[PDB]
Amino acid sequence: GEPVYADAVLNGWLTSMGLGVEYVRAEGNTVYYLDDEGREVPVLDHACGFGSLIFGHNHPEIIAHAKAALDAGTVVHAQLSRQPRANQISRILNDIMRRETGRDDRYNAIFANSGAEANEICMKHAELERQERITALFAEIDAELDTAREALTTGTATLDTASLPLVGGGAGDVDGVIADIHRHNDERRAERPLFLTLDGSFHGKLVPFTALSSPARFLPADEPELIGKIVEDERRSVLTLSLDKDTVRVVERDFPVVAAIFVEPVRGGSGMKTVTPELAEELHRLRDTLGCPLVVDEVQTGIGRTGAFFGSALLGIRGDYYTLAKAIGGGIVKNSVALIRQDRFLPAMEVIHSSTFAKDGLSASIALKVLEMVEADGGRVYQRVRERGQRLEAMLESVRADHSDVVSAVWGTGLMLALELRDQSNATSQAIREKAAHGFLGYVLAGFLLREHHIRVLPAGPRSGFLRFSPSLYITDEEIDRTETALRSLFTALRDQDGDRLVLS
Template identity: 50%
Template sequence: MTAVQPMTAAHTDRELAEPTLRGWLGTVGLDVEYVRAEGNTIYRLAEDGSEVAVLDLAGGYGSLLLGHNHPTVVARAQELLAAGTPIHAQFSRHPYANDVANRLNRIIRRELGEDEAFATIFANTGAEAIEAAIKHAELERGFRARDLLAGIEANLATTVTSVAPSAYEKAGSVPEEGLAGLLTAIAAHNAAVAARPPVFVTLEGGFHGKLAGSVQLTHNADYRTPFSALAAQARFVPLDQPGAVKDMVDGERASVLDIVVEGGEVRVVEHDFPLIAAFVVEPIQGEGGIRVVSAELAAEIQEAAASVGAPVVVDEIQSGMGRSGAFLASTLIGLRGDYYTLAKSLGGGVAKASVLLVRESRYRPEFELVHSSTFAKDAFSCHIASTVLELLESEDGRAYRKAAELGERLTAVLEGVRADYPDVVVDVRGKGLMLGLEFAAQDTATSEAIRVNAPFLGYAIAGYLLQAHDIRTFPTASAVTTLRFEPSVLLTEEEIGRLDRALRGAAEILRTQPEHGFTA
C-alpha cells in the first residue's frame, strides 16, 4: 500500500481551481477576492489586506433578491444548524418539503387565478430543475405515444378479424400484396415515426443551463454545439417574427397511420403523433441579454402548445420569486405554464434549492420512481425556502411592490444614460429588478485598447466599474455587450446615484476613446 504523501508548497502554490478562468479574470480586472457580504454590499480584499466595500448589482446572477446574508434567513440557518437538523434523511417523510410545496401552490394559484394544484419535484439548482422538466416532459410524451400506438394496434387487430376481405379490396390505399401488405406498411411507417427523437421548442437567445440536457435548450452555440450528440433536440424560434412558432410546429408535425371502416369500406387515416415534448420559455431572458418576451409571442406559444398537446415549461429560475415585480414574470405577459421551474432566490442566498412544479392534470406519478437527487428536499434548504417565502409574502407582498418601484427608478437612470450617450448606449431592457443596458459594439474603435477588448466588451466595462467605482456587475453570458443589473430590494437612492455616475464614466470613455482604454 502506497503511503499518502504530505502536502508541500509545490502542491499548494499552483492555481488548479479552473486556472484558465482565473487567469482571464486578471486581464479585465475582475480577479478580486471577496471575504464578507451584507445587503447590497460585498467586501473585497485590497492589496494591503484591508476590506473595500463594493456595491453588488450582479446579485448572485439573480439569486439575491433579499440581499446578501439577510438577517432573518441567516438566523434561521444558524438555528437549524445549532439544532442538528439532519441534512441526509432521504427516503423518509419530509413535512418541511410539503410545506414549501403548499406555500408555492398558494402563491401560484393566486397569481394564475386558478384552483389546480401543482405537484412539486425538488432539486438543487436551476439547471437541475430544467433537467427534471425535460425528463418529465419526455416521460409524459412517451406515455401519450404508447397509448396512441397501443390503441392503433388494438384497432387494427379488431378490424382485421371483423371486416370481410372484400372491404379491403375497395380501399384505394391497399397495396398489391393485399391486406397483409397494408398492415405491414402501416406497421413500418408507425415504427419509423415512433423511433424519431423528441423535439423541444424554445426561443433564440434563451438560456436554460449547461448540463447535458439543459445546454441543448440554450441557444448559444458555443455552449451547445460541442455536446449536441448527447441529449435533447431543440428547435429555436425568433422572438420578433410573428407566425414563427406555428411555422416551426407545422414543420415538426408527424403522423401515424390507422384504418377505419366506413360504409363497409376500409380507409387509411392519420393521427397526430406527439413528437414535440414541450415548449420551454423564459418570460424574461436572463443570460441571453435581458429580453422580455412579448405578450403576442406568449399567446402564439400557448396556442401552438395546445394544438399539439404539449406542455409549456416556464423557466422562472432568474425572473421568478418577485424579481420582475410579480412572483411570476410570466403572468405579466399572460403566459400560463403547465410546468414552472424556480430556483436562485428560493434559497435566500444561503441554501441551494430549486423546484419543478407540474400541473396535477399532467403529472406522472411514475416520475418519482425514475428521478431523484441526493441533496434535494432536505430539511435545511426547505426550511430556508419557507423562510424566504414568508419574507416575500409579508406585508401583503411588499417585496414585489418594492421590486417594481425600484425597477422603475433604476430604468429611468439607465434611460437617462442612453439619452445622454446615444452614440455608445444602444438599448435599455428588462422588468423590475432584472434590467440590461446594451452598449454599442467596439470592433472598429479608434482606441486600440478598447478595440482589443471588443470581443468581451461587457467584461472590460465590468472591470472598470469594479476598479474605478467599486461597483460589481457583469455582462450576460450570451450577449457580452449587455450589462445586467439584478440588485436586491434593499437598493437605495444613494446606490442608484453611484451607478448613474459610474455608467456615465464608462460611456464617456467609450465616447472619447482614450488611448489607455478602461485602465488608467
C-alpha cells in the same frame, strides 16, 4: 509555470478584463476586497449572484434562521421518510400562484439541487406524458387494424388500392400492408423527442454538446409570426387502416413528436428581454395545438425580482409546469422545485427522480423562511421591488438618453434590468475594437466600473453586449446615484474611444 489545481485560465482571463479581485466578505448590497494595505474596500454588487440575492448577501434574518436550524439538529439527510416541509413549501407556492394568476390550479412539487435539475425533472415528466399519448394512439391503431383486417377477410369492405402508396414498399395483400404499417410506426416511435425552446435560452441539458441532449428546435422569440411554419415542418405521421362504411383506406395519424415547449419569462441570455404578449399568444397556441406541456422556466429570474413572485403571472404566460431556483436558497444554500399541474401529473414520477441531496432538511427550512419574508406585511416586499425597480430603470433611461451613441436600450422589468451596448467591432481605438471582435467588450467595461468606481457589474447576452443590473430590494437612492455617476464616466470614456483607460495593458 508553478503548479495550479483550479482556475488558472479563468483567473488569467478575469485579470485581463480588469475583474481579477478576491471578495473576502459580503453584507447587503456590498462585497469587500482587501487593498495592498489589507483594508476592506466596499464594492456595490449589481450582479448579486445573477439576481439570486433579492434580500442581498447574508441577510441577518436568513443567517439567524440558518443558525437556529443547525442548532435545532435539523435532519438534513432523511431520505425515504416523511418530510412534511416539502408539502408545506408546495402549498405556499400554490397559494401565491393562485393569488397572482387568479386561477384555482393545483401543482405537485418535486424538489432538486439546481435550476438545471428542476428543468430536467420537467423534461422527464414531459417525456412520460408523450409516451402515454403514444401508447393511447398505438392502442387505437391496433384496434383500427383488427377491424380493417376482419372486414378485408370477409365480404364487408374493399381495401382501396389508391391508398397503398402512403405505405410505399411493395405489399398489396392485407397481412403485408399491415406488417409494413407496424414497421413504419415502430421506426417513428424509435425517434427521439423534440423540445421547442426560444433563441437566447438554455434549460438544463437543452443546449459542442448537442450530442449529449434530446433534439431542441430554437424558435425566434422576436418573430412569433415565423414560429408557426417552423413548428409545422416538424409534423410527422404514423399510418393506420381506417374502415369507412364499406371502404378501408390507409390514412395518416399525427404523431406526438414534441415532448415540451420551454419558455423563460425574462431571457437573461437575450439581455433581460421579457416575453411579449404576441409571443405568449403563439406559445399558448402551440401548447393547445401540440398537446404537450408549456414549461415556464423561472429558475434564472429570482423569486419576486420582476415585481411579482412569478414573472409568468406578470406577463400572462399560462404554463402547465413551472421551475424555480434563484433566491429560494436565501443566498446561502441550494434548492430548486418543479411544479407540475396535478391534472397532468403522473403519480409514477413521485418515485422516479432519485437525488441524494434533493429535498434536504436544511434548504427546506431556509425556503420556508424566504417565503415568509417575501410574503410579509401583505406583500410589501413586491411593492418595494417594484418601487426600487422603477427608480433604477429611470436612472438607466436617463444615462441612455445622454449616451445613445454607445447605449442602444434599457431592457427588463422590476429589479431585473440591463443596458444594451451598441456594437464596437468597428471602433477607432484598436484595444476596444479587438475586445469587441472577441465578444469581451462588456467584460472590459465591467473592469472599468470596478477599478474606477468600485461597482461590481457583469455583462449578459451574446458577445457581452449587455450590462446586468439586478441588486437586492435594499439598494439605496445614494447607491443608484453612485451607479449613474459611474455609467456617465464609463460611457464618456467609450464615446472618447479611450482604449488606454478602458483596456488594461
